[PDB]
Symmetry: D2
Subunit: 727 residues, 4 copies
């Protein structure tokens, strides 16, 4: 054979390239020299293919992989065709049960390093030295939808990190919002059954916008805080690179003295916080349901490595009861104004997997996977979680040896007396399978807890009380955090929250549920309640108008760290600009445009009304990445229309729609020269408007203005103008 093109244009270059420049590839082929200890120890299971013979799984070479064995060339397939049956059998058994929740997720390899030793507050080995590099495997996910559901749904996002430390696996299994919907793990199945597709008909997919969700919510006010975050633009992140991560639960750090410190874990996106807007998110679930998975993969292939700073909120044990909320209550956040986040280290995601199924689908994360130096608390949500991941993994991954699946293997030593189980890989040579034993001199042996390399010993928390199935009275406060969140949002963020509630409740068929939910909103904030009520054609009653607001949280009436946008933090590197081409583009504009974008690490995608190429005004041939319809504005962060023969595309319905959609979605638009003729489809005044860059040509001043708008992510001042744009 030789089916590959002779020019070798089927194989992507093994060097960092921008999104769309090359065909994507398995991580180890795309970036063979990107290495970490985990990545190198997977080498024993990596399988090549080039220059090898096609075989059965038994090593038998296949001569004809196009046909079944049959009696006569038009005859019946024979039972002795063991080659076909192994091939069909393996194919028949490819699928495994998806994750009960978080079925849909995208993952990558990276590494973590602390900024300084933390041995004063924890004996966790991986945090003990700034020169200690810990390999990590991170899986980002949605919650509700299946493995085949869309990425840009409105939903909570999971942010799971597997740390391969020298003293064991530590999994930090968090989300992108700082609290959870419920307090006690006992209600997890209830909450999840409510949010998931309804049981009679299994609708709807990847949406909380249905009766059972809001029914549960209306009846369980502890859910409101997380509901507020889901309804804000927090629920529709622009990318996994631009969202926060949180452990949610208060855990413990244990030092070598044995002193305990309460801790809440944070992931700060070094690319900053950025979210889509609902219409864009929802239309993007249809134009590219793999948008976040793709963005993650392609950012890493381009060298735009996702980077997060690990941060700790540290509270002394003696301060347990100093807040007006319970620290153990997972529906309560610790305002950063009260307890600052300490920057602890940085994680870089620099390598995609080779095989999605082998590494991503089979990865198993557990919040209970902790290491000496860390400890749990009595948080009733976390307590039940400790039981569940262990349990589900047994059927999801077919047995108790899931830790032998390559991606899950610890990189450090593991020796115990556990044996057998389905698909046992380890061949134990120990003469003993029990302890104590004398026949192997008691090895492997226990190890006393200690400052370093010691056995795990639980912090001896004092436990006093009767065996009761009872919610702590301290957890029974449901509206102050939701109010603190609401009040900390900008006015446009508030409006997006109102719009999120209004949209969702509109799809709740039973009108009494919307009413009960509006009643809950009235206990949070009157304005919020009223605005949602008005969109539902619901009138608040007298009594609902007089519900006294909940108290501030420890004196706080807002905390800007809860807003996505209140405090500027955007980074343009890794963002993407759509350039609407024409058949005689002014080459000087393109040059200026492309040079300025490249200087900021901003990618461009060159669009036209057909594929192939177009020729600029000087014969510069411009290759076309996609059509206007093929790569809608939804997939880019800003839109630039260079000068040239504008009449070529000025009647292109698609070209005009591109601009109106970008405009509706608050994206920066830049128009050069006669590209300003496009102002009429998006109805911009002759004197202009903030958010629209326009000039005689696309020089350096024009790009600075454009790039400044992109750093501010979206043009929020345009909100009130998009009403009268039919798009």
């Amino acid at each position: 054979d030789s089916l590959a093109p002779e020019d070798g244009s089927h194989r992507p270059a093994a060097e960092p390239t921008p999104p769309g420049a090359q065909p994507t590839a398995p991580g180890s082929l795309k970036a063979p020299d990107t290495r970490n200890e985990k990545l190198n120890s997977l080498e024993d299971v990596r399988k090549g293919s080039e220059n090898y013979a096609l075989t059965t799984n038994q090593g038998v070479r296949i001569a004809d992989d196009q046909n079944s064995l049959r009696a006569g060339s038009r005859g019946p397939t024979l039972l002795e065709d063991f080659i076909l049956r192994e091939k069909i059998t393996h194919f028949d058994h490819e699928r495994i049960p998806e994750r009960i929740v978080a079925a849909r997720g995208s993952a990558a390899h990276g590494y973590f390093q602390p900024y300084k030793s933390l041995s004063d507050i924890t004996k966790a080995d991986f945090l003990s030295d700034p020169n200690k590099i810990t390999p990590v495997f991170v899986r980002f996910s949605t919650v509700q939808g299946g493995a085949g559901s869309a990425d840009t749904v409105r939903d909570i996002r999971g942010f799971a990190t597997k740390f391969y430390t020298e003293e064991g696996i530590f999994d930090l299994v968090g989300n992108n919002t700082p609290i959870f919907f419920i307090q006690d793990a006992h209600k997890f199945p209830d909450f999840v059954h409510a949010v998931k597709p309804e049981p009679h008909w299994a609708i709807p997919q990847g949406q909380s916008a249905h009766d059972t969700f809001w029914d549960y919510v209306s009846l369980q006010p502890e859910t409101l805080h997380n509901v507020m975050w889901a309804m804000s633009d927090r629920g529709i992140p622009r990318s996994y690179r631009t969202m926060e991560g949180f452990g949610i639960h208060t855990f413990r750090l244990i030092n070598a003295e044995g002193k305990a410190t309460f801790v809440r874990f944070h992931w700060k996106p070094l690319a900053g916080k950025a979210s889509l807007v609902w219409d864009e998110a929802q239309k993007l679930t249809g134009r590219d349901p793999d948008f976040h998975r793709r963005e993650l993969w392609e950012a890493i292939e381009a060298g735009d490595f996702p980077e997060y700073e690990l941060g700790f909120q540290l509270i002394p044990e003696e301060d347990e009861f100093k807040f007006d909320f319970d620290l153990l209550d997972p529906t309560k956040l610790i305002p950063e104004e009260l307890v600052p986040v300490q920057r602890v280290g940085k994680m870089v995601l620099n390598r995609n997997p080779d095989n999605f199924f082998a590494e991503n689908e089979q990865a198993a994360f557990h919040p209970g996977h902790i290491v000496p130096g860390l400890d749990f608390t009595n948080d009733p949500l976390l307590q039940g979680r400790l039981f569940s991941y262990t349990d589900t993994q047994i059927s999801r991954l077919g047995g108790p040896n899931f830790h032998e699946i390559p991606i899950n293997r610890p990189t450090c030593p593991y020796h115990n007396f556990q044996r057998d189980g389905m698909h046992r890989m380890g061949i134990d040579t120990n003469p003993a399978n029990y302890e104590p034993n004398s026949i192997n001199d008691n090895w492997p042996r226990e190890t006393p807890p200690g400052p370093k390399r010691g056995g795990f010993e639980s912090y001896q928390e004092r436990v006093e009380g009767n065996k009761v199935r009872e919610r702590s009275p301290s957890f029974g406060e449901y509206y102050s955090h939701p109010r603190l969140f609401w009040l900390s949002q900008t006015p446009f963020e508030q409006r997006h929250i109102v719009d999120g509630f209004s949209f969702e409740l509109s799809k709740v068929v039973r009108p009494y549920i919307r009413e009960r939910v509006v009643d809950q909103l009235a206990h949070i904030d009157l304005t919020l309640a009223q605005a949602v009520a008005k969109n539902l054609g619901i009138e608040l009653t007298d009594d609902q108008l007089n519900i006294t607001p909940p108290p501030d949280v420890n004196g706080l009436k807002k905390d800007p760290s809860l807003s996505l946008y209140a405090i500027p933090d955007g980074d343009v590197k890794g963002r993407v600009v759509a350039i609407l081409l024409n058949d005689e583009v002014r080459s000087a504009d393109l040059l200026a445009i492309l040079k300025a974008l490249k200087a900021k690490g901003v990618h461009a995608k060159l669009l036209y009304s057909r594929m192939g190429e177009v020729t600029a005004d000087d014969g510069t041939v411009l290759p076309i990445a996609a059509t206007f319809a093929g790569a809608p504005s939804l997939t880019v962060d800003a839109v630039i229309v260079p000068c040239g023969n504008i009449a070529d595309i000025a009647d292109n319905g698609d070209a005009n729609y591109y601009l109106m959609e970008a405009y509706k979605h608050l994206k920066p638009i830049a128009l050069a020269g006669d590209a300003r003729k496009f102002k009429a489809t998006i109805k911009i005044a002759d004197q202009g408007e903030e958010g629209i860059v326009e000039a005689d040509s696309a020089d350096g001043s024009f790009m600075d203005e454009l790039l400044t708008l992109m750093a501010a992510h979206r043009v929020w001042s345009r909100i009130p103008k998009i009403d009268k744009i039919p798009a």
Copy 2:
């Protein structure tokens, strides 16, 4: 308790209602008077709930289904909480592997009746008498995406019918286009891997618009015929009600005298043929990924029964 509204507006009318008029409901609650032999035989496994006490799977009534058992109300959860562990355990094990292909599908019960006896050409009992009614269970599906993928993708559609006959179950497992992409079953994994999400990143979902699919097609010209059908508006049906169905293969009909006749099976939509247009289809995967499932459920709830000849 007093959770339901006093006006009873939480319960959908148990009668035919048009789309959007009432919340949808389990079929036997929505339409209790509809019956067939197969639906009556499922009665022994059906479980109600109104007026029953909440229990474990061993029948122990639960007193507090809001909390775990702990040492103190702010204390650690205890291992002896068997109610919590049974509930979470069942919850933890809810999923089963989705179908290798056709993971995304919508089904419904119904019945079949032949217009006349076909005993001159087949001794199949279910086609032997116009008065013989055969209960069916039909699952419509896409091919490529997972169970959580969108309905209005561009894809082939499956149309499987389970016939509960008196001489055994007969399954007529077909598609909405008259041919298949490939000739020999040996290449099934090849073709299915080529159309499915590429193995390095598992993109894209529910789409044949990516390199590996077209690579395969370009190298295996036998696939062109079904590709033509896929690229036409047959790849995006308006609903499962407005698409044809085909068994594709030539099977055999065998009569009582032992005579064999070659037969190709067809399903004719009595609501006629109708498809979306690409743009509409794709936007709709975003606006309502469950549109075909919903459309089918609602037509049946409304009394607009999908009919096929």
Copy 3:
């Protein structure tokens, strides 16, 4: 802690040692220098223990492995004890489904080598060169009983060999009898259900002595040939080392020129053929249900490697229809008088596994696992088998990736486009997962068939006929092979067959089934039928007495290769002798005795009325291996009683019964000096009798005589003398 005895006696010497001398141990610790390519390829999953810290599966060191985490030392166990929960979880999930048949099996690693190139008749790479060594993994097994059933039951034995060749795994999955019970695989479940424990109460285990088996047999005369083999002493082998092995089916060898030759596979035991006698075997299932497993393992630890010679019955394609029986009928054997076995190679089993579960329990053999140079035939039993193993392994071993379980992995390359599945270990980097593809230049690629290293292509056999569910009329002959077998047995073998049938039919509760079996036997041979009828109190009718015997098999009225004992092939190496001690053993007899046994590789076990030591007449301290009741005569091949203070054991019931049992089971007995007092125990005349070695001391020819008896295995002439005797 440090629990081993200072002295180091907890650990066995890593050198060959006789059975009972040291504690047995994992193969790689017992014989670290015994290597082969497959043993070395398993090093990647072998796990040590000595000097490592005890950890969870995630690598977290454990401090206290004696206790659960509780609230207070007398308090409730906490859900947060993740160490407890992982430990118990792994334990809870240790088991996997046992094999549907052959659940009870004992396995060992070894190697194979051909005597000369077989290139003229097969292109199979493992048979192409005498210097080409092929690693093997062999499992021996019973059929009916569970994995926990006993070894020395009456049953057929399995003999499965996994050949790890350079061109693929080749599994030869045979039995210890040259035919099977049934003709077509469609009746396998019927036959197996019939022989297995009855469905209402799951009785009996490991036994065909029950109604449903004999009911099936009586209604399906095709089963009679293999029933005869099972009823003979063939069904109770002395050891897996002393039984023949056979592929049963006719397969094809294909040479490079494309010529097909019919072949039946044979394994000749280099230690010769030897079986137990029923009373010993049944009793041995109680005294030591692990007798065969133990003997195999201890033979290997001792260096008495089980050795077998691969042999081929070869038949040209033109001779297919030249026999009275169909070559494709698996209920028919090919008499070695008609088609001799040509010697092909030697297989030596020289290392025990490390972990029984991982290597033995998870091993998956498959007769459809063939390599270029071999092919199948239309044998209808073989045809169905090709389907069954593939299917069963997908649930037994949890998925389609069982070829990745270390023991089953090919040692040669394996590359294809098969992906995912539960427990997927290989991480594929191939950009393509389908062929044909241009994106990986079509790799891995198909390979045309050729003389060496080529793709598999089936032999192009002509197929002609209608699609029918029909038994070939050539298979409809059931009694002539049974008769040929019968006539080839010695008189004492024939009595044992009569006794096996009588015993088994005595356990069939429904008398008419017994009568129906008797009627079938009367179609085989009148003497056989009458002797069994007589033992069951049945009288043959006059019509039965005149049923004409079936024809000879192609002119043969007997074939001595069908007998265990007709042609001497006795080998004493690895056999064992019981030595009955007293408290003043004549040390001179003992030196004479032990050295003579040692010279022939015959082991000994020094037995007494208690454990500890005895002091010989010269002060020599003699370590006791076991008591008379502890290691009964069933476990040894012969008994020697040396001179000394015989009055010490003369009135010991166990010592006397020891000799009665060994005398009853036809074992050689040797009595030195005053040990001749035991002659009255077993009723021996003053003169002496053949089978009893006696002399004033163990000097001169005492040991050579004893060893000549051991070479002939059992004293068959004593049979009539055992009739009486209360033992």
Copy 4:
């Protein structure tokens, strides 16, 4: 869960309770019971919260653990009284 293939082992005939059993647990391998309850969660208003929790009581009440007093530190320690 592995010996009997899933979480629905209470549906295997020999294991089924002979008394009533209703809850909001769904699915799992080999699910026999076909639930008609509109709701698969509680609290719910759509099925009027059925099936419902039952207070503990003298007869036919819901299960309530005996309220033993628990006092001690989180320890992996054998009681000295067991020694």
